Design a protein around this ligand. Structure first.
Ligand SMILES: CC(C)[C@H](C(=O)O)[C@@H](O)C(=O)O
Ligand SMILES: CC(C)[C@H](C(=O)O)[C@@H](O)C(=O)O
Ligand SMILES: [Ca+2]
Ligand SMILES: [Ca+2]
Ligand SMILES: [Cl-]
Ligand SMILES: [Cl-]
Lengths: 364, 364
């Protein structure tokens, strides 16, 4: 019977790009004989406007009833004066992650053929290409560790957050990184700050214990400050980067920015049952919303990760990936992927969804 | 009477570049009539070899007896198998910082005229130039917060580090950033993760309280993951970046790497009495040590920050800065600042110290 998907398109460009992800999914549903039912729920800014909070009860219960969450983007100027902590992004994403135990965040980033000039890296570096998958631990560390809070008053008033990791937490995420390296270029670089943090000393030690199960995979360790530097110089020498919550937050965004093409990048945040939340790497771009300008490929590839990882539909996932590839190499680019002089060749969001869905239909 | 400087040259290239910083200081001592006495102490790898630990008692007591510490670089392959936490870098630097309450870290980084091609940024971005001063809080946050440690065993064994900040700690570092912005381009960008961390919510709130004393300075806030991205795209729009310990560690290194010329970058770590520890931004480069290849400018500019900030000798500090400028614009570059084809023009470490010291003598 039917898969059930909770669709949480959110704010800004979220709904208009979600529309295209749904159009391409309809083509993959027809092509592979999948029965998938979708229910839309508010989340983020639209949920604060419609329901008074960024993650309404009904939305959370709809996600509980689903096989996966296909998530858009949340946030925008309009809610940007609420405390940073009643704000829509953090208020949608952290409770979804904590509630469904979404410990694994996978962010594949690569420099696509022919779009090297868009990367902010000097041309000889982006010409080498890169393909880095960031595996970030998402439900532990300093994000959800306790005690967190503040005490005291005046000058001596103090706040505190505790970064905490157990061997169990590190070993589950490290295994995912090694398993992913096995299928790629067989190297895991584990990123930590083991010269300062007890958490990272335990991190490094556990990742080395996990490595015994992967003698075909090379493991190196690097400090987060050195990784931030080395991704600027030699990103082509990394394969799978394995990070705790706070380090992976920073490094996965640094690598996304280094592609120069965030409109192509998606994200999977999964638990150990295979339920996940699938979203584009980029934000809600509220200034271009409503104009048919936004690149829907990130939301479309989010749907492909959802099919692969939550729905175990590998053929359907790869048909969407290939249909994206076909767009990128057949002159179907949106404006932000085009150099300043080629920009009159830009396709709109709908034209991109039509092309990719048609390519799925045509059997790409 | 005499200033007293503890000289802790450390490992790798540290001594050979320190030799040049001392040669240039001798020229500034003659030119400005300063009486400065220097005593050398082991620290880092050389201290572990000679004394069994990276920060011997006698070294720490020599720094207590000094007006400033002129520090080289620590670390190298040879000690890289000790626990990451008996290791020379962390074992020299964190106790010096904690012991002398060196709360303020200043790392000025700029793209120098004529060396834009060396930056790993695409050519149109490095052509715009940048000049970012990172002000990092160095004695609080998660580096020295307690409880830190681990408990338990097997799968449930857990480690923890606590990030802690008081208003007093934030306000002292924020004032330094605002005061520095006042003398530069009048903008402070405060970097935090206020959407997740209680510490950063208090950070943001206190920096906004401090801002009332600087109505001429613009304050913006940015999340660390977004700052890591925005420095790749528009580093020319930042002036003073204001960070807690762990965020400033990452961002100051990202910005150093983005210049492409770490051999030119120095660092000041100071307490509120004006005692500081002055060191190059880069590491001990143990593979080029002993060969006369290393660029001594970073250690030389460290001496200039030492004269300015610890010894209140502004004229002497600026004469060294100008003498460096003169080298860079008179064809005195070391090999790593030269493109692959111009590399036969490379000056050696001694030739660079001779030139800069002679320029100080000549009245630059
Ligand atoms: C909104 C924020 C809590 C979140 C995080 O830090 O994880 C976001 O930056 C991300 O990367 O998903
Ligand atoms: C060696 C390490 C403890 C240190 C730090 O993290 O501060 C270093 O990375 C630095 O930036 O001075
Ligand atoms: Ca992020
Ligand atoms: Ca560092
Ligand atoms: Cl963390
Ligand atoms: Cl910190």
């Amino acid at each position: 019977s039917s898969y059930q998907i909770a669709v949480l398109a959110g704010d800004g460009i979220g709904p208009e790009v979600m529309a295209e992800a749904r159009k391409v999914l309809k083509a993959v549903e027809a092509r592979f004989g999948l029965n998938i039912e979708y229910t839309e729920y508010d989340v983020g800014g639209i949920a604060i406007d419609n329901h008074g909070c960024p993650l309404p009860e009904a939305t959370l219960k709809g996600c509980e009833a689903a096989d996966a969450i296909l998530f858009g983007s949340v946030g925008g100027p309009k809610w940007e004066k609420l405390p940073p902590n009643e704000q829509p992004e953090r208020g949608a994403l952290l409770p979804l992650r904590g509630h469904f135990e979404l410990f694994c965040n996978l962010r594949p980033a690569k420099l696509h053929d022919g779009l090297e000039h868009m990367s902010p890296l000097r041309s000889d570096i982006s010409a080498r290409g890169f393909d880095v998958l960031c595996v970030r631990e998402l439900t532990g560390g300093i994000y959800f560790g306790k005690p967190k809070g503040r005490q005291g008053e005046g000058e001596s008033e103090e706040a505190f957050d505790t970064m905490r990791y157990s061997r169990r937490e590190i070993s589950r995420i490290a295994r995912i990184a090694f398993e992913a390296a096995r299928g790629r270029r067989k190297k895991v670089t584990s990123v930590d700050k083991a010269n300062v943090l007890a958490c990272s000393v335990l991190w490094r030690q556990v990742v080395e214990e996990v490595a015994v199960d992967f003698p075909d995979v090379e493991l190196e360790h690097i400090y987060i400050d050195n990784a931030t530097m080395q991704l600027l110089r030699r990103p082509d020498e990394f394969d799978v980067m394995l990070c705790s919550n706070l380090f992976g937050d920073i490094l996965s965004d640094e690598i996304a920015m280094l592609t120069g093409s965030m409109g192509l990048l998606s994200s999977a945040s999964m638990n150990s049952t295979g339920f996940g939340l699938f979203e584009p790497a980029g934000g809600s771009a509220p200034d271009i919303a409503g104009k048919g300008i936004a690149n829907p490929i990130a939301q479309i590839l989010s749907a492909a990760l959802m099919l692969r990882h939550s729905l175990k539909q590998e053929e359907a996932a790869s048909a969407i990936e290939r249909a994206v590839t076909k767009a990128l190499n057949s002159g179907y680019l949106t404006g932000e992927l085009l150099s300043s002089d080629q920009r009159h060749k830009a396709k709109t969001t709908v034209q991109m969804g039509d092309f990719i869905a048609d390519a799925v239909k045509a059997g790409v």
